[PDB]
Write a structure and sequence with these properties.
monomer; 169 residues; two-stranded antiparallel sheet; 61% helix; dna binding protein; hydrolase; DNA repair; monomeric
């Protein structure tokens, strides 16, 4: 099973995020910018800071989809200039988009503020708007939000777990 209602979506976001944030807070800032993790496509090595940038980029993109929609613009999925089979390259874009935020603590604050903006976004829609009808092809709005919030938060926690093993060896 996967979240199937507004209430379960919000729970899954808060929960996955709280576990991720605990792990992120435990990383020494002076190590957060070094290439130490496997990336989002074959043969890359990324930093913790890159991983957080990835999450913020996906969250800002979900907000961007909603902004385009609010303004009556046609949404290009996943993003203008990218196909769905090019999500590895989109990851690269997100790393570069936040590569200026060089203080680890400002990076974490940005991620938190993004998560809160996404929770506030979901809160504006009814359970029926989110889960009772298609939004992108057969996918509901809720599912499309989930895929790019709660799911990458959990995936990132798993990646951090592997790292934290090494840093105790």
């Amino acid at each position: 099973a996967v979240p199937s209602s507004k209430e379960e979506l919000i729970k899954a976001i808060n929960s996955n995020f709280s576990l991720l944030n605990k792990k992120l807070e435990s990383i020494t800032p002076q190590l957060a910018f070094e290439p130490l993790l496997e990336g989002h496509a074959k043969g890359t090595t990324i930093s913790v800071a890159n991983l957080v940038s990835y999450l913020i980029g996906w969250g800002e993109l979900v907000l961007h989809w909603h902004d385009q929609e609010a303004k009556g613009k046609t949404i290009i999925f996943p993003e203008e200039g990218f196909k769905w089979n090019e999500l590895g390259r989109l990851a690269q874009k997100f790393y570069r988009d936040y590569e200026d935020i060089t203080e680890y603590e400002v990076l974490l604050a940005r991620l938190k503020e993004n998560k809160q903006q996404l929770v506030a976004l979901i809160e504006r829609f009814s359970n029926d708007e989110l889960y009772g009808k298609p939004w992108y092809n057969k996918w509901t709005r809720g599912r499309m939000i989930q895929f790019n919030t709660a799911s990458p938060y959990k995936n990132a926690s798993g990646r951090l777990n592997k790292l934290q093993k090494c840093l105790a060896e």
